[PDB]
Ligand code: HEM
Ligand SMILES: CC1(C)[C@@H]2CC[C@@]1(C)C(=O)C2
Ligand SMILES: [C-]#N
């Protein structure tokens with residue numbers, strides 16, 4: 001399904017890339033997107049897939065676009081256009097200066113101060129989940145750890161019942177990697193339908209959970225509205241149930257296939273934090289964008305008001321121009337460059353919580369299960385979208401090679 005080429009788009013810039021089903025997906029999602037960085041591909045191309053839109057292929061352009069919110073607005077951040085138009089989460093769908101006031105409040109429920117407060121619970125849950133799997137000698141990492149670890153921590157922070165995970169998780173997945181049963185707009189409404197009654201309930205009987213803090217919060221000295229609160233909590237649910245969950249699987253998949261890298265972290269534990277950064281670069285997984293506020297000449301390309309442009313956060317770090325031998329994983333990499341957590345005024349506010357969950361996972365898993373690998377004959381399949389992920393990751397190991405402690 002290719003949309004008719006717009007009149008202002010030259011044919012030499014056409015590259016029909018499908019962000020929801022890249023043709024080289026079987027080789028790994030990151031490898032599939034990297035095709036946009038081959039020698040014969042321009043720095044900015046137009047794809048006729050998913051309604052038609054621009055795609056910045058190099059970190060230089062991606063960073064520049066994210067810094068220039070006057071021309072590249074977050075008002076319509078998702079492709080396809082229907083999704084981007086329906087997208088109204090706060091503060092991701094806002095541009096400065098109005099965005100800032102809301103970002104401050106959001107930082108209050110996911111900022112570093114909140115991570116320090118969860119420090120104990122994060123550490124405890126990781127050890128508990130891993131210790132329970134250790135004696136089994138096998139696991140389906142995606143649903144046995146990757147999901148429950150980050151999600152239970154989020155559900156506790158938001159004061160929501162763990163039994164609501166299945167439903168909420170399904171909805172958020174439809175917003176980033178839709179299966180076709182629900183449009184972005186339908187998933188958003190379902191999400192709001194779930195939150196509306198909860199927000200009102202907590203505005204009446206204020207609690208200490210993230211939702212209560214947002215619902216009874218203030219934005220630059222004035223009371224937040226129920227509508228605004230709803231839009232903020234919606235974003236929280238999505239950011240709490242998708243990114244970290246998927247990134248942990250890309251990292252564990254890599255460790256399972258690389259006995260040498262596991263040994264390195266076992267013999268030199270002080271490199272874990274640095275390894276986390278190298279993995280964040282190599283297995284970057286987000287790709288959203290912006291909409292043009294007006295006609296604008298960008299790097300020799302004529303963009304028209306209303307045009308959508310995908311600015312893959314994932315591609316900056318894979319750009320050979322930013323990191324030599326980009327597909328190569330080296331924990332000793334001197335200057336690790338990437339935009340995995342975004343760039344510009346929307347720079348991820350939960351990155352401190354994400355790094356903590358990643359580092360804790362690396363340490364506590366290798367400490368107990370230093371030896372493991374992909375299940376016999378298993379073929380790990382990835383899925384592409386606004387947030388890419390791993391469909392399943394069956395792992396196996398010899399229980400006698402593990403250490404309970
Ligand atoms: C490894 C996982 C993570 C990655 C790769 C990631 C990535 C991103 C990126 C690329 C953006 C900016 C998107 C844009 O410019 O439109 C973003 C925004 C944001 N992230 Fe994360 N994130 C991660 C984890 C988290 C977690 C755990 C939380 C908190 C529960 C969180 C909360 C947020 C919030 C609130 C924003 C919006 C800030 C704003 O729009 O001003 N993120 N994230
Ligand atoms: C593209 C994103 C990672 C960013 C934070 C969560 C996400 C899925 C959004 O809807 C905005
Ligand atoms: C952030 N997700």
Ligand SMILES: [K+]
Nearest residue numbers: 075084085087
């Ligand atoms: K919108």
